[PDB]
Each structure stands twice: as C-alpha cells, then as structure tokens.
Design a binder for this molecule. Structure first.
Ligand SMILES: [C]C1=C([C])[C]=C2C(=[C]1)N([C][C]([O])[C]([O])[C]([O])[C]OP([O])(=O)OP([O])(=O)O[C][C]1O[C](N3[C]=NC4=C3N=[C]N=C4[N])[C]([O])[C]1[O])C1=NC(=O)[N]C(=O)C1=N2[C]([C][C]=O)C1=C(O[C]C2=[C]C(F)=N[C]=[C]2)C(F)=[C]C(F)=[C]1
Length: 647
C-alpha cells in the first residue's frame, strides 16, 4: 500500500507504535485503542507527504492542509506528531528548500568535530532547529570517508561507493534531494585463477555452495551449540571456520580409510579364494588321473569316480562364481574412490577468494570477527538492489555542506567539557602554529573510531573519558580496505559485467587485488585490497601496486590488450590520520552493545550532558555504512535539541 509504504520507508512498523513513540505519547498508549489507530494514520500520512516530495520542507500547516477529513480536524494531535517526526529527523532531514527562513536569533553553540556524513547530517538538523553550529574539519574537504577522485573526465569513489537497497534507506531521500545518479550493479562475477585462467562454472558453483555450507555451520555452532568461549577466550569467526574445515577434512580422510579397508578386505578374500581354488584344482587333477586308471566293482568304480569328479567340478564352478562376483566388486571399488581430499589446491585458493570477499565486506581478517555477534545487524538489511553513484558519492556531503559554518584544515587536538560548557582547541593544518579556541555549550564528536583508538591520542579529552567509554573504544574493531583506481583510454574488459575476481595463490594473501570492480560505462577499474593485505599493501608505492594490477589484467585478457593507464589513485585508509582505518567491525569479545555505549553522551559529575557522539561506530543496527552515519547524526541532533530546547 501507499501510506503503509511510507512507514516501511521510514523503518517503522506501519501498524504499531514504537517504544520511542510510546515514551513521547504516553497518553496514546494508555488511552483508547481507537485514538492509537488515529495516531498511526497521522504519522504514516505525514511521512508520505514528506517522502513524496522531499525537496521542500514539509511544514505543519501543509501537513494539516493535505490531511483529509476527519484527520485535518484534530489539529493538536497533528501538530504533536509533526513536531515529533521533525525532531527525530524523520521529516525535514537532508537538504531541502526552507519555507520558514532560519531564525535570526540562535540558541546554544554546538561544535561538531568532523564534516563527514554524520557531522553534516547533524549540522543541518541543528541549524534547522535554530542553533549556532560550527563544524571543525581537519581535511581540506568535506565528506570524510566519502571521498570522490576527479581528474579529466574520470570520476571514481575512494571511500564509500555503494547504496545498499533503497527500501527503508534514508539515502533514498537524499538521492532525490541531491540528484545522485544511481546505477544497479549486475551480479555476475566471474573468477580467474592466478594464472589468469577462468574458473570453470562447476568449480565456481561447487566452491561457493561449500562456502555457504561452512558459514552456516559456524552459525549453528555459535547460536545452537553455544560454542562461544574457548579456553577463556572469545571465539572468532576465523577460528570457527578452521574448525569446520578440519572436520570436513577428517570426514574425507575417514571415507578414504573405509574405502581402502573395503579394498584390502576384498584383496584378502581373493587371495584366500585363489589359494583354495588352487588346492581344488590339485584335488581334481588327482581324481582326473584316477579316472583313466579305470570286473563288476570296476564297472561301478567308474560310475563312482565320475560322480566324484563332477562333484568336485561343481564345487569349483561354484567357487569361480564367487570369484567373479568378488572381483566384480573389486573392479568398481577401485573405479569409485571417494574424494581423495576435501579441497584441491585450486579449490582451496578459490575458497580463499570467497573468504577474501567476506574480509572485504567486514574490512578485517576473519580471525578478528566475533563469532557470536559479527553479523548482529543482518536483520536490518534494506530491500532492493544495491547501486553505485555514477556522478560520485561526494555529491552528497558537498550538497549537505551548503550554508554551513565549516572550518576546513582545522584539526581538533583537545576537547574540554565541564558542567559550565565546553572548549575545543584546534590547529591550522597548513600552519600548525596557528591555534583556535572554540567555546560552546555542546560538542558533537564524530571523530572516527580509528582516531579515538589512536595511541598516543590525536585528540585529548579533559577530563579523560570514563572507563566504560574508553574500554568500549578499546574493544571495538576498526578495519581497513583499500583501492587501486585505474583510468584507461579504452575499455578492454567485459562491459556487461561489473565485477570479476582474481583468485590469490595463497591463504595469507587471499585479499590482494582479489576483486575488480567496474563502474557502469566508464574506462575505470577499481581493484580491492582486503583482509591481511589491506594494511600491509599501504607500504607499497603506487607505481608498484599498479604494476601488479596490470600483471593480473594482462594475465586475464592478454598482454597486448592492456594499455598503460592514463591516471591512477591508491587509497591508504589506515595511514590516513583522519581515518586511521576504514570502518568499525564487531571484534571478538565485543558486541552490538558496545555500539550503544559509543552512542551514550557524557555528563560531568554532580548535572547535564555536554559531549555527544555520532558516526558509523555509534549505531548498533547500521554500523559501517553511509546511511548509518547519517542516521546517527540525525539521532544526536534530536538528542541535543531535546536537551537544549526541550522535549
Ligand atoms: C573508508 C570506506 C571504504 C573504503 C569503503 C566503504 C566505507 C568506508 N563505507 C563506510 C562509510 O563511509 C562510513 O560509515 C561513513 O563514511 C562514516 O562517516 P562518519 O561516521 O561521519 O565518519 P567520517 O566520514 O570519517 O567523518 C569524520 C570526520 O572527522 C574528520 N576528522 C578526523 N580527525 C579530526 C577531524 N576533524 C577535525 N579534527 C580532527 N582531529 C575526518 O576528516 C572526517 O571528515 C561504506 N558505507 C556505505 O554505506 N557504502 C559503501 O560503499 C561503504 N564502503 C564499502 C566498504 C565495504 O565493503 C561498503 C561496500 O562496498 C562497496 C564498494 C566500495 C568500493 F569502494 N568499491 C567497490 C565496492 C558495500 F557493498 C556495502 C557497504 F555498506 C559498505
């Protein structure tokens, strides 16, 4: 349906109130059921009005005007609902034409550290709410881990790059607002072995299905058998994977042993049977000789010796009957061995390609992921096909930057917060002698987890953060992932495929240049560096790693088909001091609960909160994504406005 779709698109149950709404509307949950049903229709229709046209502000007045009778009659309730939705960023979020110009007199000073999607999203909210917002950003550009390279006619994303499904995705709104050109990804992804030979279809399918089987087995191990702690240590996904492969190898070795035992036993029966047939041939040779040597007892001696000869001959024909039914069992046993090994060497390399794919998705070696919780956010996937941004994902944060007070090249070094307000201290990255002091009522920290983990610290907190926050920082994973961008003057790959895989020769390096990505109709190739390779490869110069790319591609398509690239780019997210990695992951011994701890604001001791946190690492249900960063910015804007302007 139409207004039900709007609730789904807002990640809300269309037919019941959330706990959050129950808190804000206690008179509804405790009141008659009929009024609760009225509430839900107001909410859904208001969201639809916004979502049908997110390019302009949806005001209370326009909501009231577009509600049909009787709903346009309960003005107070309509306003309450509109107000709630607006405060939580469910309407009037992103970038839109304001009908009511911004209030000229402000209320509260908020410093936002970082101009990534989370910082920008919060800034636009807080500015809409009438506050004085200033973003301090260390880079010379906005977007943070959204980073688009442009040179000549080439455009390519170095950070985030995919919109996952649009159904339920707040980025769907931003797409309409900003005019992102989205393009569906074709799912076919051919694999090539390290010699450049294509992986045959059967091997591709066999290994992939086994990969799915192994992984489902780890999840059974974890969530049915409660095999989550071992020798006082939390189990990692990599560990469980090694265990389930070891058991398959054991099983293969068993069926091989059973089969060899059947072989040996049949050989032993043949040896025995032949020895017995031998002695019966000798016995018949003796009777056949005493049969030609032949009175009345003699005329009866021949009858008896023929009865004896042909009875031994019946014994012998029956034993050669068993001889045949046995060496017929032997022949098909030698012709039907069970698998010699679990995984051929080539099979293993291909399986390591799928593991690399998973290390790409989580940005970290599998041996670091929590077995129990690494995919705790699975249940929140959006519906619809994934897409890429043909005009470059930076268009989103660049559009969000319009009109904001943003100080670039301004690196926060220290954050002071007391019960009387806050001070943020920063240096000019082009002249680190120049120092700045920003007084404010509240600080929103969107510093990446990688920056928070940095030892010695990049940013100093005064007073230091509480143990519950720092130890959550300590526990959480922050992974890495890098790209080689290859710009050519001609397209030599299969234009109808967006993806193809290079199977690494060894397990340790399975993530090196394992995936080649294709951007729609454009002579660009992205090669991914995942897993253990991602951090190590940062120590390789651009020219050498490009050379390794070209060697792979020449192996796949032919040495003369691959020209020299016109432009190249290489991400080094770990070494980037403003990222110190790519995005969080649930490390073994962490859990979704640590993301909630990350989101919790700090209050100086006996009082009201001063220091707030947003960023992809603060949102339990959508971590490590652009939309999660966005949603987290909206969440904190709501929390801060609730604090400083009232619920
Ligand atoms: C890095 C990365 C990469 C490479 C990739 C990716 C990613 C990443 N992602 C994630 C995102 O991006 C995130 O989440 C966000 O971004 C976050 O945001 P925030 O939170 O806000 O943060 P930032 O941005 O960083 O911001 C912050 C700020 O701050 C600043 N600073 C620092 N320090 C300082 C400062 N200031 C001052 N002071 C001081 N001291 C900085 O600078 C900044 O600004 C993502 N996501 C999404 O959604 N998408 C995508 O795409 C992504 N990605 C990826 C990975 C994985 O896999 C993904 C994917 O894939 C896809 C692809 C890509 C490529 F490239 N190629 C191919 C393919 C998927 F599929 C999915 C997902 F989800 C993800």
């Amino acid at each position: 349906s139409g207004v039900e779709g709007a609730a789904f698109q807002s990640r809300l149950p269309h037919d019941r109130m959330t706990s959050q709404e129950a808190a804000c509307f206690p008179d509804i949950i405790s009141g008659p059921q009929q009024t609760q049903k009225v509430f839900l229709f107001i909410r859904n229709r208001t969201l639809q009005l916004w979502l049908d046209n997110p390019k302009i502000q949806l005001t209370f007045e326009a909501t009231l005007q577009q509600l049909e009778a009787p709903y346009n009659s309960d003005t107070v309730l309509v306003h309450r609902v509109h107000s709630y939705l607006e405060r939580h960023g469910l309407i009037n979020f992103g970038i839109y034409k304001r009908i009511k110009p911004l209030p000229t007199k402000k209320t509260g000073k908020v410093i936002i550290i970082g101009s990534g999607v989370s910082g920008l999203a919060a800034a636009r909210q807080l500015q809409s709410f009438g506050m004085d917002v200033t973003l301090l950003e260390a880079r010379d550009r906005v977007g943070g881990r959204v980073a688009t390279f442009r040179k000549g006619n080439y455009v390519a994303d170095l950070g985030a790059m995919v919109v996952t499904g649009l159904g339920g995705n707040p980025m769907a709104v931003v797409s309409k607002q900003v005019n992102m050109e989205l393009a569906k990804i074709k799912q076919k992804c051919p694999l090539y072995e390290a010699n450049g030979q294509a992986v045959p279809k059967e091997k591709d399918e066999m290994v992939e299905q086994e990969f799915n089987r192994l992984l489902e087995a780890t999840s059974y191990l974890s969530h049915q058998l409660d095999f989550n702690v071992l020798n006082n240590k939390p189990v990692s996904l990599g560990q469980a994977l090694e265990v389930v492969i070891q058991l398959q190898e054991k099983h293969v070795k068993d069926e091989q042993i059973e089969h060899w035992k059947k072989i040996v036993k049949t050989q032993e029966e043949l040896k025995e049977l032949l020895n017995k047939m031998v002695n019966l041939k000798e016995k018949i040779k003796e009777l056949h000789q005493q049969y030609k040597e032949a009175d009345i007892t003699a005329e009866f001696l021949v009858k008896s010796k023929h009865r004896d000869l042909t009875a031994l001959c019946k014994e012998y024909d029956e034993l050669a009957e068993t001889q045949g039914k046995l060496e017929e069992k032997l022949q098909e046993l030698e012709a039907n061995p069970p698998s010699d090994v679990y995984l051929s060497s080539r099979d293993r390399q291909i399986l390591d390609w799928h593991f690399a794919n998973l290390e790409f998705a989580n940005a970290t070696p599998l041996s670091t992921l929590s077995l129990k919780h690494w995919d705790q956010d699975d249940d929140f996937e959006f519906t619809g096909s994934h897409l890429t941004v043909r005009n470059g994902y930076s268009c989103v944060p660049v559009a969000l930057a319009e009109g904001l007070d943003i100080k670039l090249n301004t690196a926060v070094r220290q954050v002071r917060y007391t019960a009387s307000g806050c001070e943020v201290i920063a240096v000019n990255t082009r002249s680190t002698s120049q120092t700045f002091i920003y007084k404010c009522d509240a600080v929103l920290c969107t510093l990446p987890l990688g920056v928070l983990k940095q030892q010695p610290p990049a940013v100093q907190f005064v007073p230091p953060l509480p143990e519950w926050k720092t130890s959550a920082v300590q526990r959480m994973g922050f992974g890495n992932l890098n790209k080689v961008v290859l710009c050519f003057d001609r397209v030599f790959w299969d234009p109808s495929v967006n993806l193809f895989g290079h199977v690494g020769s060894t397990t340790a390096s399975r993530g090196e240049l394992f995936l080649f990505w294709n951007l729609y109709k454009a002579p660009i190739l992205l090669a991914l560096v995942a897993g253990e390779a991602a951090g190590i490869m940062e120590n390789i110069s651009d020219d050498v790693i490009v050379g390794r790319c070209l060697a792979i591609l020449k192996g796949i398509f032919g040495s003369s088909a691959v020209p020299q690239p016109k432009e190249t780019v290489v991400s080094r997210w770990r070494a980037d001091p403003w990222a110190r990695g790519s995005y969080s992951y649930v490390a073994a011994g962490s859990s979704g609960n640590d993301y909630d701890l990350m989101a919790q604001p700090i209050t100086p001791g006996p009082p009201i909160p001063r220091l707030f946190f947003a960023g992809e690492h603060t949102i339990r249900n959508y971590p490590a994504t652009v939309h999660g960063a966005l949603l987290s910015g909206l969440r904190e804007a709501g929390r801060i406005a609730d604090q400083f302007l009232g619920a």
